[PDB]
């Protein structure tokens, strides 16, 4: 496939190195600049780095110069950013980039320069009952709490339910941790017969969770 | 160094509208080395136009691109609910390469209500020594809302966080979470805890409620 995939984000102590990979599939690599851009958290794209076909010519924005090196293996197809003295204001998503009359552009890979330490997250269920129920359909969810750093990843039922899904984003807590719901909406009727299972991955801790969402039992409901 | 000035910052319009989009540069950007991208959540930029008014592959006619020396454009010329985004210019005829800062373009459509659900804290979160209440609103339009949490009929303040999804590309609606966080002893000193929603699509505000340990 004509494709780029980065690798080797994560979080780094302030001041600490990261190396990031970008390896191209799909088209000749060796006739084209290659180019790192960033964005933070919220905000807009800022140009990284450039890199000439051969190498030979490199490009850097001045807030990275000296700190970052861009580099290619031709023959390997990769394209790297060494970081160095990594410092707050480089915690990013970064993108390797092709930027030709056709764009290709890797999945993005994020930074995160920090000293606070990993943590995965508690999972609780937010349980549908008639409190949640509206003619026919029920809401229901999981409460992913407690993380650091960001992201973590929520399915239902393994991926197989997507349809009517809202994950919520990320807040930071006072406490400086993570904190978001996933929820999703499904038909009311069936809520006795059909599973529902929320799926938390946080792949900063290695945590999986499957959480099993299971209806409220209620007795001050009408009868029947 | 040649800076971006987008404008404007934010444009909200109906489908079957035309949007404009500015982008105005510090200098004159000699050849025509200006490129359009169209950012949506979770994703890559994607090119639209590169080298002014050129449109790439597989971009919809209804996207194109003016400008030279100095201003340039970007038309959307009829929007669907799926074009809602974030748009950049940049410039590739000096370094630094460089971005605008962005058009967010919301799409509006009739108001719509939201449903409103609420959650008691689980047991099982409970166990460990504080308790989380949910709020949900689900599927409305426009973005605006208010959310208030009342404790035994007293207004809650400082103890809750808000979180609402980015515009959903079919159906152009919101959704929000309020959580209210309280420590389980506070949460065992009071018994009806009360969500109120105030909308433009409801008729006055609602309130979902529910008593501690009740079932």
């Known amino acids: 496939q004509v494709q780029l995939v980065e690798s080797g984000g994560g979080l780094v102590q302030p001041g600490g190195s990261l190396r990031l990979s970008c390896a191209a599939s799909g088209f000749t690599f060796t006739n084209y600049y290659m180019h790192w851009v960033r964005q933070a958290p919220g905000k807009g794209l800022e140009w990284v780095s450039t890199?000439?076909?051969?190498?030979?010519?490199?490009y850097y924005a001045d807030s990275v110069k000296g700190r970052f090196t861009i580099s290619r293996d031709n023959s390997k197809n990769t394209l790297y950013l060494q970081m160095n003295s990594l410092r707050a204001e480089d915690t990013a998503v970064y993108y390797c980039?092709?930027?030709?009359?056709?764009?290709?552009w890797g999945q993005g890979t994020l930074v995160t320069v920090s000293s606070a330490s990993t943590k995965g997250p508690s999972v609780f269920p937010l349980a549908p009952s008639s409190k949640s129920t509206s003619g026919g359909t029920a809401a229901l969810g999981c409460l992913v709490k407690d993380y650091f750093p960001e992201p973590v990843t929520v399915s239902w039922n393994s991926g197989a339910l997507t349809s009517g899904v809202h994950t919520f984003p990320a807040v930071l807590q006072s406490s400086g941790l993570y904190s978001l719901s996933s929820v999703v909406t499904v038909p009311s009727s069936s809520l006795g017969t059909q599973t529902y299972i929320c799926n938390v991955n946080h792949k900063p801790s290695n945590t999986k969770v499957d959480k099993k969402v299971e209806p409220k039992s209620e007795f001050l409901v009408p009868r029947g | 160094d040649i800076v971006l000035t987008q404008s404007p910052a934010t444009l909200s319009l109906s489908p079957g509208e035309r949007a404009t989009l500015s982008c105005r540069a510090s200098q004159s950007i000699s050849s025509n080395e200006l490129a359009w991208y169209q950012q949506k959540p979770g994703q890559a930029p994607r090119l639209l136009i590169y080298d002014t008014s050129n449109r790439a592959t597989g971009v919809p006619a209804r996207f194109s691109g003016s400008g030279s020396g100095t201003d340039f454009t970007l038309t959307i010329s009829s929007l669907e609910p799926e074009d809602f985004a974030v748009y950049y210019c940049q410039q590739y005829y000096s370094y630094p390469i460089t971005f605008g800062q962005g058009t967010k373009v919301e799409i509006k459509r009739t108001v719509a209500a939201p449903s409103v659900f609420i959650f008691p804290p689980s047991d099982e979160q409970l166990k460990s020594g504080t308790a989380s209440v949910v709020c949900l609103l689900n599927n409305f339009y426009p973005r605006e809302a208010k959310v208030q949490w009342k404790v035994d009929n007293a207004l809650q303040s400082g103890n809750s966080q808000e979180s609402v999804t980015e515009q959903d590309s079919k159906d152009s609606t919101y959704s929000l979470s309020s959580t209210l966080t309280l420590s389980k002893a506070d949460y065992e000193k009071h018994k009806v805890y009360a969500c109120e929603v105030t909308h433009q699509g409801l008729s006055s505000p609602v309130t979902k409620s529910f008593n501690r340990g009740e079932a």
């Open positions: 890199i000439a076909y051969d190498g030979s010519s490199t």
């Open positions: 980039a092709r930027w030709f009359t056709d764009d290709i």
